[PDB]
Amino acid sequence: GRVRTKTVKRASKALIERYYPKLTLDFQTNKRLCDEIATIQSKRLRNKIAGYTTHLMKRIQKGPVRGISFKLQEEERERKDQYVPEVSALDLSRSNGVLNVDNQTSDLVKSLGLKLPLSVINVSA
Amino acid sequence: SLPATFDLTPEDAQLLLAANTHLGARNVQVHQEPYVFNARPDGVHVINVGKTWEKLVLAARIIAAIPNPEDVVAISSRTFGQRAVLKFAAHTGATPIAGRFTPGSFTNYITRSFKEPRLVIVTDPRSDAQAIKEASYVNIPVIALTDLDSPSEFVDVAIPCNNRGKHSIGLIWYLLAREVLRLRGALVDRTQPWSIMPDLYFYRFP
Amino acid sequence: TRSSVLADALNAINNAEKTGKRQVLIRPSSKVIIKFLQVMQKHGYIGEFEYIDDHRSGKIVVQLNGRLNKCGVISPRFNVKIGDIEKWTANLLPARQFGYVILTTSAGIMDHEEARRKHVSGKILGFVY
Amino acid sequence: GKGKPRGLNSARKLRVHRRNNRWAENNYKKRLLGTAFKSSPFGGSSHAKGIVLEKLGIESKQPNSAIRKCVRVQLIKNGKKVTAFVPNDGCLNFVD
Amino acid sequence: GWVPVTKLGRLVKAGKITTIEEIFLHSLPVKEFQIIDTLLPGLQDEVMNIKPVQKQTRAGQRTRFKAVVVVGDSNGHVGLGIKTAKEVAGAIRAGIIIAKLSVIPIRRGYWGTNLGQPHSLATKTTGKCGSVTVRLIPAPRGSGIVASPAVKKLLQLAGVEDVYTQSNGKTRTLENTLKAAFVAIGNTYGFLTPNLWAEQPLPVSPLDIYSDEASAQ
Amino acid sequence: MENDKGQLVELYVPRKCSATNRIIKADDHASVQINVAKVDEEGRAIPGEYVTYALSGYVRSRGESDDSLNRLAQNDGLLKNVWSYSR
RNA sequence: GGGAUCGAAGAUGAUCAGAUACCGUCGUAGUCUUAACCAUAAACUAUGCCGACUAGGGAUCGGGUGGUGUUUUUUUAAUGACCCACUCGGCACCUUACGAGAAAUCAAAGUCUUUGGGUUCUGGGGGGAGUAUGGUCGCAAGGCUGAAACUUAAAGGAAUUGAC
């Protein structure tokens, strides 16, 4: 069971989250990348990190794996303000300017003493 | 202690009739039969929307009574109320708690979820029941948006609406939001309709 | 069957005060009940109230303010003498400072301090504080 | 109303109820039947004299194992045979 | 230096509240014992009981200690706190703290006349906890405290000078007895008398007069 | 409560409730104090001037504080046509 | 009188393991009625009876009042049967707790130290003991009533944890 230690996972994951496009599918160039871009004191643990960058780069070029990319939270902030329909369902133009409503609710509005466009569609049980 | 400026608007009444806020629950509790207008023959009761309006007016008065606008907290575990509460608190200055309520948020002075409100506003007192029970320990008033079979334990001023239809919920939060802002002074004229549509407070899904 | 009526009346008054209400409906009524409630109303443990006729025996609607802690009856109406008052006011009242054990003397029904002042005695109905 | 009568002309039922329920005590029943005057070996007195008939090595086993030093006496006033403990003398050297 | 975390606490630290009578007036929940310590400087505690209790915690037979502690002013501010802890002195200290939190006032009054200071209670009161019921009756001046020495000590830490007591139930279990006596002395500010029938206007809190202060930044 | 010198001898006067007029005690945390803002002619709230209410933990816990506060508001002219005295 | 089933006793074949005792087949009394006797149960809802007050909710059972309800259309009706709304009077349910209790729990086991609506019966640590004796009822079996001597520091009720 070759479970990668926490330092290799976190370092390789960070080097792909921040520094994605420099990294490649090849171990021998990502190894030189990990030589040049992080201060890893030992060649062996650098090879661990570099081959795990290679494996995760093989995984991410198939689909977006759950890393860090701060380009979508602002789009979700925009998504709150995107779908503002210009005609609401509360707007009378959806129902030809009239409120289709029952006899008792019309009796309520008559008791209010307020004049609104109302069409009395009766219901029963 | 109210001018006739505060009275019910024909535009707002058209809005409230369009949102089916008048369509009350099937069964009605003991303490909310004052809010019932009548029962339709299909078993749906009718909510006195004028009473509803003046309850929103008094609730807006109470929200105006808190000096610092941060101690006002809106609450929703209701799905549509999440949208409504977030956009409400955006336009208001209050703080929202959408989704799941963390217990011990009003007790437990140590944790990071520790907030000190001076007012709690609730979409559904049945879905947000634990927030009512939590507010019942640290002396916080509770404003609720009660349908006609909503439980009225530990509640202050309660607004009769329909918590089923999302248009009703978004519009109730909408009207309370605009009336609070008109009472503050950022909406100086009363003749002015609130320019943001009630569709910003309604809930969407792709 | 229904044996005492002032007992049932104070039962209903005390229950509605425990729930915090504002009014009660007593059925039936009596002269004794009216005099008792006048004694209450004189010191003002209650506000105003009202008789209702139905030709049988009246009903009473009482407005009760907030001031009643507890009222009750002493159901065997004991014969009491003058110093005996100092026993019952040592038993039933919450302090020497207030509270009214009420007596039924031959000069009417009233609280114990008036019967100190009028220097009479009689039987005992109940206690109010 | 608490399962007992409270009428103002009901003193009789109350005192008959007390005289029936005081026979359930212990001291009352010993006291008004003359129990001590009939069967207790002293006959209802604080002391008594008697004549030693035997010295007894009674045994107390559990949980305390001890050899109790006792004396079988026949009392003078009654003709009653009573065993009794004698303290502080391991030898019983003051007793024959 | 103590930093608060509650807006009541940073009001108390700001010197904007003087007595606890505001907190007692406004029914506030206290969660900082430093407030009680800064507002009751003459608050004198006393231990009532320390007892070793044998726990069985995850295959471990261990010894913890139950400490029943009463704090109390020589005026009318009492507090009760019960704490189990692994150490004796930690149980003492945290029981002191829990008693600092549960401080309630008392309404000590008169018996008979109106001279000098109130010495006895003002009415009869009653507390219950478990099967222990404790009944407090006012007493004449200079009559001492007719109570069992635990209850007597909890009353001496109140400035109650004269009271008759009667109990009922199994008063062997002393924590039920101290809780029942504590409920009895808490209920004295709970019985409405004719000299407090006078209608009073509702005053404002310190939470809104001092709302611009004491806010979390 | 006062002494024979006529000076008051109490720690604090308790707040009473308004729905049931009973005493709100020093540890009723289920009770509630309500501020309702005084309005202007324009419909702006006066910042430091409120009308206050007291609704005790028994009142609020029983499920009555809504109806009772409606009664208190309409009797103080903050509502209209809501609380009916006859039912 | 009846006697089909099953079946206290009895008469019997047993056996194989310490898998417990065995079991199995026949079977009188009885079980079913008539004329009488007896009067006991965990005869429990382990909760006396009468009466008032105090929260909701939705199902049912019996009765009744309404509906420009519904259906069976007989032409309209009227029956009935359901649905809706109300009202009594039940047997039960389900929440809570305001209140009670030691707790389980209780809309009464609530309105009880802030102790009183009326009234009947019962109990006073455990055994000895529902035993002895006497009275009474009964053909009998038994029932009702009912001790003391002596002996003893617990016997208990509810809830809680984990170690063979």
Numbering used by the authors:
A (entry chain R): 2 to 126
B (entry chain A): 2 to 207
C (entry chain W): 2 to 130
D (entry chain X): 2 to 97
E (entry chain C): 34 to 250
F (entry chain V): 1 to 87
Authors' text:
In this work, we unraveled the intricate mechanism leading to the release of AFs Ltv1 and Rio2 from pre-40S particles, which is coordinated by the r-protein Rps20. Two β-strands in Rps20 connected by an unstructured loop dive deeply into the (pre-)40S subunit, almost reaching to the Rio2-binding site. Strikingly, ATP hydrolysis was substantially reduced in the rps20Δloop mutant, revealing that the Rps20 loop plays a crucial role in activating the Rio2 ATPase. To determine three-dimensional (3D) structures of pre-40S particles from rps20Δloop mutant cells, purified via Tsr1 as bait, we used cryo-EM and single particle analysis.
The structures of the C1-S20Δloop and C2-S20Δloop particles could be solved at an average of 3.47 and 3.79 Å, respectively. The main differences are within the head and at the bottom of the platform region. In the beak region, we were able to partly fit the solvent-exposed domain of Rps20 close to its mature position; however, the cryo-EM maps harbored no clear density for the two β-strands that deeply dive into the pre-40S head. This suggests that Rps20 is not yet fully accommodated and stabilized in its mature position. Strikingly, we observed a density detached from the head in the vicinity of rRNA helix h34, in which we could unambiguously rigid-body fit the X-ray structure of Rps3 in this rotated conformation. While the Rps3 C-domain protrudes from the pre-40S structure, the Rps3 N-domain is bound to this pre-40S particle but in a different orientation than in mature 40S subunits. Enp1 was also more flexible than in other structures, but we could nevertheless rigid-body fit its central part (aa 252–390, compared to aa 205–465 resolved in wild-type pre-40S particles) next to rRNA helix h34. Under the platform region on the 60S interface, C1-S20Δloop particles harbor protruding densities; focused classification of this region allowed us to unambiguously fit the alpha-helical C-terminal moiety of Dim1 (amino acids 136–318) into these densities.
